[PDB]
Amino acid sequence: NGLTVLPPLLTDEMIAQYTSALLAGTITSGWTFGAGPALQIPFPMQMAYRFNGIGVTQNVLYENQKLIANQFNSAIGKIQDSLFSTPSALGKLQDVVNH
Ligand X SMILES: *[C@@H]1O[C@H](CO)[C@@H](O[C@@H]2O[C@H](CO)[C@@H](O)[C@H](O)[C@H]2NC(C)=O)[C@H](O)[C@H]1NC(C)=O
Footprint of other proteins (CB under 8 A): 2, 4, 6-11, 14, 17-18, 21, 24-25, 27-29, 38, 40
- 3-state SS, residue 56: coil
- Centre a 10 Å sphere on the Cβ of residue 30 and count the other Cβ atoms it contains: 19
Contacted entry of its own copies, ligand X, other proteins, none for residue 19, CB cut-off 5 to 8 Å set by kind = its own copies
Q: Please report how many Cα atoms fall inside a 13 Å half-sphere around the Cα of residue 57, on the Cβ side.
A: 3
Decide if 58 contacts 51 (C-beta within 8 A): yes
Q: Does 81 bind its own copies (CB under 8 A)?
A: no
Using the minimum distance from each CB to other proteins, give the nearer residue, 9 or 97: 9
Interaction residues for ligand X, span 45-84 (CB under 6 A): 67, 70-71
Closest approach of Cβ 94 to its own copies, in Å? 10
Given a contact cutoff of 8 angstroms between Cβ atoms, the answer to whether 39 and 29 are in contact is: yes
